[PDB]
Design an enzyme around this catalytic site. Structure first.
Site, mmCIF file in Angstrom:
data_model
loop_
_atom_site.group_PDB
_atom_site.id
_atom_site.type_symbol
_atom_site.label_atom_id
_atom_site.label_comp_id
_atom_site.label_asym_id
_atom_site.label_seq_id
_atom_site.Cartn_x
_atom_site.Cartn_y
_atom_site.Cartn_z
ATOM 1 N N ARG A 1 0.832 -1.199 0.000
ATOM 2 C CA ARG A 1 0.000 0.000 0.000
ATOM 3 C C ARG A 1 0.868 1.251 0.000
ATOM 4 N NH1 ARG A 1 -1.858 -3.686 3.581
ATOM 5 N NH2 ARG A 1 -3.815 -4.695 2.923
ATOM 6 N N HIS B 1 -4.282 2.281 -4.949
ATOM 7 C CA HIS B 1 -4.657 0.864 -4.858
ATOM 8 C C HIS B 1 -4.609 0.125 -6.210
ATOM 9 C CE1 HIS B 1 -6.245 -2.335 -2.380
ATOM 10 N NE2 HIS B 1 -7.232 -2.556 -3.228
ATOM 11 N N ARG C 1 -2.212 -2.991 -6.690
ATOM 12 C CA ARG C 1 -2.665 -4.171 -5.927
ATOM 13 C C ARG C 1 -3.699 -4.960 -6.714
ATOM 14 N NH1 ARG C 1 -3.363 -5.859 -0.307
ATOM 15 N NH2 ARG C 1 -1.082 -6.050 -0.200
ATOM 16 N N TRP D 1 -2.549 -11.127 2.098
ATOM 17 C CA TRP D 1 -3.911 -11.452 2.521
ATOM 18 C C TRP D 1 -3.879 -12.719 3.386
ATOM 19 C CZ3 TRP D 1 -3.579 -9.927 -2.841
ATOM 20 C CH2 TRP D 1 -4.221 -8.708 -3.125
ATOM 21 N N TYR E 1 -11.442 -10.119 -6.488
ATOM 22 C CA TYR E 1 -10.738 -9.266 -7.462
ATOM 23 C C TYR E 1 -10.659 -9.868 -8.864
ATOM 24 C CZ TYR E 1 -9.110 -5.553 -4.287
ATOM 25 O OH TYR E 1 -9.052 -4.472 -3.434
#
Lengths: 309, 316, 309, 316
Positions: D154, D270, D273, D296, D305
């Site tokens: 991040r 973001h 990612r 994660w 996603y």
DNA sequence: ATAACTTCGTATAGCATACATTATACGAACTTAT
DNA sequence: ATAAGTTCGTATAATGTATGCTATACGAAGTTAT
DNA sequence: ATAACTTCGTATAGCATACATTATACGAACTTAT
DNA sequence: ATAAGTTCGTATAATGTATGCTATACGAAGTTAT
């Protein structure tokens, strides 16, 4: 008691916190429980654990599934928490009896059921009998079966489909904004559109009723009920096999989920991976998918592979 | 004292909420604790922490295994917790003595024991010998061992299988539906697939036994001295008899056991579970797949069964 | 107060519920906490949350690791639970401050450390300098390094090894009842046995002290301390690199776990699977193994593979 | 009222136990709730359930997203729970209105939005263009985007990287140590490996910036109009500026964004990612490996996603 | 002056963990147009 | 009458969301070394 | 009579989930024999 | 003196076990259709 009246006014005011189907189930359980209470001289609101226990056993003696007894208890729990009262579940007698009911019903051989698979063999066989038919009902029913098999959408989802919800991809394959259809199924859905005249208004739902004259009635405000979509699966099963077995048992003919069950199983036969079988039908928990494909030779497990080699 | 008696009878009334084995062990421990109390003139209900502590030390001194002593404590704890009373383990005297008893026994070299593995080679050897037998009992026994090894099911699970629980795959392979295991109670349950060979072993047993004359019949039944099977829908082949099958099969190949009194000198009910897990690892089966085979939901015990590389690197 | 006296008598009576090392840590934390309390005019038994909070911050200001502050709190928690009193952890002030201390120390760049790897390059290099040595210390130290690297046993475990604990497998490879040694290491352990005379009594521990004359003293009742086994790793490091870096930082030379760290890393370089790297050293949690091999090219992950292809 | 004030000051005193962002949102929600209370003459502390309910309906009517309304409720809940008071959500009025607001907005077609993916092709295109630039700012930006895509970190995590956090592998690949993420606070932390190419991009930025003149310097710093980097050990390149890098890079290739006011018309913090997760799945990377790449600990969001087979089977 | 930020305030997503709602099944009663 | 639905109630299968932080999204206003 | 069980009582393992103990690090003080 | 330890206290890394059922292990005694 004023706290309970308030809590109940809270519930009615914010009605829309729960769907219609939840309310119908809630009301159905309270009806059943109050009837039992009256007949057995028990108080129905503030429900006592001893009375809830007796009623759970009564439901078992009526021959109801473990999952049904859980709905009844779950709704009773919900009415009590939303009234600010103690939940029956949080009592020693009820948690013990429920645990007891669970074990006993399983040893008597109670089985969790699921929709009779509607697979490729069935869809080719149905196409074999209905594709040369000029009958508007047959044309609608074949288009529905193709979408159900190809998209794995639930019946409520298919009933919601509008004409304006359909676009197009490569080669002229239809796309539905909620899934992509094959060329053969896109063709079937195309034919229905012509003979139905649904496209003559974009806001019309793709599927509409067809009366006894053979004439379709498009609607932008009325959907074909999910009950009628189950009707299509049942009637298609009768066509090939005639009337269903005696004594009301479940899943003797095809129903709403039959095509979802079937398409999953046919993907598994094609060695398709579970992570992607899950993506096809929008599954998030694997225990459901694996339950549809459990009895397939591709799913037999590692011991069978070791022993056969 | 009013509530305690009510809580007790609430549990008794819904006794089926617990295993018959839990009740069996509660009463056995209660017998033994009550006996110890009588010998030392002590109140056995509401149990006093100091007394329970003396009792556990008494069990240690009788040479009982750490896990036996834990069972006696656990039964006493359960009786008190479900009575609505403080557990003996709520006191430092009892919880500290239990740690101490464990550490002292372990330090003195006590180890938990494990069933003798029954593996693919054993199954292959047993099958090469018994498959030529026409006896109903031999045919049952070989089909049982096939199922035990193929499915990794526990003896109680095998004993509860009814004919109607069996279905078939596309390819002709048998599937056994299992609803209740030691760790799972479900109406969804699980399906256990048999290989083609094991399918045939089971097929042969059905034919000669006539168990399929009623779908409610348990798959396995007793076979009396004249080789005639006695199918039942109300009585199961006891788990004790299934254990006897493993012991008898081991005896057939290796002869009679020592005189040493030890456990696990012959194969037992758990032998095919430990053996199949080990064969899978050796064949390079993945850990999630081994877990799925035995119905384990946790990576640790599966890992513990397979413990027989640095040498190979040092050579040279 | 009588409940606390009883609880404390419980503790002393069932002393053996905890190991010596646990007691030493317990006593060490109470010493530190009582000293602080006296100096700061606080009551040490029944510990107040406000005082425990102040003392936790004091430990942080002393520059102690987060894991050390947790030991102090963990021991204080243990004394209080075993005395039947409320644990400091179960108080709002202490749980907040500990959470605060955690975040602040990490942002200041505090690092969890681990033993400097003793690998193949090091073991070949040490063998290169010590194998032609007739010195009894060198012969013992080389045998120890081979066992440590080859077995991945902890130092307390190696100190416990008896002569009667050693057997033999294929090709004459030694086996230790608690792990199998290579041919080259079995040879090294053999040479030490001859010059030490430990085998002349089966109950003797394999490793014993060697005095300044070069003469070994076998013992069935006294083990070589773990401190002396760390000494071997340190002295071996000094041989090649001389005295260690200035200002007492940790893991500047090899120590007890160096060979465990190193053998794991060399297995990973050989593409050996983590599930079996874990079995070699008796690991059950993977977060420790993965922490030893994290900075290896074989462990770089899926993005590095995707980007390089 | 004494304890409430004590519980409040206990939380304030150890404010660092929580994120600076949590405090920021508490005060922002408090501002807004207090304003709504003043307009309707209401007590804002101890908040009344009926008032909170009116307020949430008020937020719904202002066209705010379901997740915004949940944040306002959540901040109010936290303030009351940590005060030692009953949460607004402890009452049916508030918990029922929140369900209702969610279901009504969803039914009206509100959907949560998602960052525009920044994938391998985008990185390849950006790199083909900017790698020939000698400007310090271009060299920084390309190294940043390399790290963002390679590591899935991040923006705040990237901004906290100090030079001393970087080490090297056997093969010359850079490793970045990360101690604190949005989900993990550890002294063990994690190591993030850079590919050989990304390593070089980062190598080039270190050289031209001079950030390594102090190991305590943050890896990334501002670059002023004359291309001269301003390294710091006390100040980070703001996460707002890192977002600007993504937006500026998107602008370079696609031009200026619409006038529509929407979120996610250009790449954002973001973007790398969501893009890297999707590239991994497409390359058939395993789900545990994708999870390990992004840090994660849960199979569900990773799965969410990657949602773009039945067609292929039907052909014919 | 200006590029290239920083600082900030409102808006809203990520994420992991925990826990109950909402769908289909289907006989059957009801409704409508053919 | 009846095909062909819809609406209903209850039986049972199958998905969902609430919670408690912690984070990013982005326009706007303020800042500083050129 | 007997094979082939069943029934039972004490002994102890399996299993999954939850939670804190016990090891090494290392400077340093202490002990012993060379 | 000093090599070469051991013992100690404290700093920090790394494994472990307690809990609450539910199960199997196995000798011994009792049973029933041959």
């Amino acid at each position: 008691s004023d706290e309970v009246r308030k809590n109940l006014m809270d519930m009615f005011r914010d009605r829309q916190a729960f769907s219609e189907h939840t309310w119908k189930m809630l009301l159905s359980v309270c009806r059943s429980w109050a009837a039992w209470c009256k007949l057995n001289n028990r108080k129905w609101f503030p429900a006592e654990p001893e009375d809830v226990r007796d009623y759970l056993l009564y439901l078992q003696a009526r021959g109801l599934a473990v999952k049904t007894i859980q709905q009844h208890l779950g709704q009773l729990n919900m009415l009590h928490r939303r009234s600010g009262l103690p939940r029956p579940s949080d009592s020693n007698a009820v948690s013990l009896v429920m645990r007891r009911i669970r074990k006993e019903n399983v040893d008597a051989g109670e089985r969790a059921k699921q929709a009779l698979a509607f697979e490729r063999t069935d869809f080719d066989q149905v196409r074999s009998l209905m594709e040369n038919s000029d009958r508007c009902q047959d044309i609608r029913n074949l288009a529905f079966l193709g979408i159900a098999y190809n998209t794995l959408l639930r019946i409520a989802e298919i009933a919601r489909i509008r004409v304006k919800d359909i676009s197009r991809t490569d080669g002229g394959r239809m796309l539905i904004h909620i899934k992509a259809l094959s060329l053969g199924v896109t063709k079937l859905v195309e034919r229905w559109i012509s003979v139905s005249g649904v496209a003559d208004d974009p806001n019309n739902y793709l599927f509409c009723r067809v009366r006894k004259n053979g004439v379709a009635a498009p609607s932008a405000t009325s959907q074909l009920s999910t009950r009628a979509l189950e009707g299509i699966f049942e009637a298609t099963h009768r066509l090939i096999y005639g009337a269903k077995d005696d004594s009301g048992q479940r899943y003797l003919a095809w129903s709403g989920h039959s095509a979802r069950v079937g398409a999953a199983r046919d993907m598994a036969r094609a060695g398709v991976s579970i992570p992607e079988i899950m993506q096809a039908g929008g599954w998030t928990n694997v225990n459901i998918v694996m339950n549809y494909i459990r009895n397939l030779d591709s799913e037999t497990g590692a011991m069978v592979r070791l022993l056969e080699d």
